[PDB]
Amino acid sequence: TISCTNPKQCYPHCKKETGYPNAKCMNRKCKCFGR
């Protein structure tokens, strides 16, 4: 798990991890659109 206080961080990180950049972020959490 990574630490992201904003979606702009999991946006690009997931844009390559799973290809889907659409990723949300929560209290020190990340919910991509297809983990």
Task: List the beta bridge partners of residue 23.
Answer: 32
> What is the C-alpha separation between 28 and 14, in angstroms, rounded?
16
- Alpha carbon 8 to its chain's center: 8
For residue 11, the enclosing domain spans 1-35
- Strand runs (DSSP E) across 1-35, as ranges? 23-26, 29-32
Q: What distance in Å separates the CA atoms of residue 31 and residue 15, rounded to the nearest whole number?
A: 13
Distances (CA, A) of 10 to 27, 34: 13, 12
Tokens of 13: 């990180």
Method: NMR
For the domain that residue 9 is a member of, what is the CATH number?
Answer: 3.30.30.10
| Number of domains comprising the chain | 1
Q: How far apart are CA 28 and CA 19, in angstroms?
A: 21
